[PDB]
């Protein structure tokens, strides 16, 4: 397993615009198009992202390309965030994948707000962090996914994903 497979499991793959868990226009492997309620808006951003007139539909290859860019950007965002970087650099490879997952889902900003959880992770107090991480909107809104990522920081293995 790795970050790509992990996220492909959590996000799914849809080739037509769809609404995510928050009701936002998305396509592909969890590629958020816009927070606006306008479908036209969404179509416009899609076309812009892909470079053609898509008419709200994309190919598998195009979804994968957006996915690669999105992972890449998620990593670079962590490395660029003064609050995130130190934590991320202190983690083992498995746990780093979990941190990327969170960033991809809620943004760097969003993650950067888990102050207490971050320090616990940095200190390697796994169970404690796991408990603190679940005390969140994130966890109450998408509990199964949250549980998978949480177990991953807890154990440092991919068990949640097998
Ligand atoms: Cl884009
Ligand atoms: Cl979920
Ligand atoms: Kr992180
Ligand atoms: Kr976190």
Curated annotation (Swiss-Prot):
Pfam families for the chain: Phage_lysozyme (PF00959)
Tagged with keyword Plastid: no
Protein's gene: E
Molecular function as annotated in GO: lysozyme activity
Catalytic activity: Hydrolysis of (1->4)-beta-linkages between N-acetylmuramic acid and N-acetyl-D-glucosamine residues in a peptidoglycan and between N-acetyl-D-glucosamine residues in chitodextrins
Effect of residue 26 to H: Facilitates transglycosylation more effectively than hydrolysis; covalently bound substrate
pH-activity note: Optimum pH is 7.3.
Compartments, record wording: Host cytoplasm
Entry protein name: Endolysin
């Amino acid at each position: 397993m790795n970050i790509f497979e992990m996220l492909r499991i959590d996000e799914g793959l849809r080739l037509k615009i769809y609404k995510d868990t928050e009701g936002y226009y998305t396509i592909g492997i969890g590629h958020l198009l816009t927070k606006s309620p306008s479908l036209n808006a969404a179509k416009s951003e899609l076309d812009k992202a892909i470079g053609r007139n898509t008419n709200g539909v994309i190919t598998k290859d195009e979804a994968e390309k957006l996915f690669n860019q999105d992972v890449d950007a998620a990593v670079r965002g962590i490395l660029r965030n003064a609050k995130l970087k130190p934590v991320y650099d202190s983690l083992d490879a498995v746990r780093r994948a979990a941190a990327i997952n969170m960033v991809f889902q809620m943004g760097e900003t969003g993650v950067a707000g888990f102050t207490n959880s971050l320090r616990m992770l940095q200190q390697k107090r796994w169970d404690e962090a796991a408990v603190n991480l679940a005390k969140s909107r994130w966890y109450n809104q998408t509990p199964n996914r949250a549980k998978r990522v949480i177990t991953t920081f807890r154990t440092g293995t991919w068990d949640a994903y097998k």
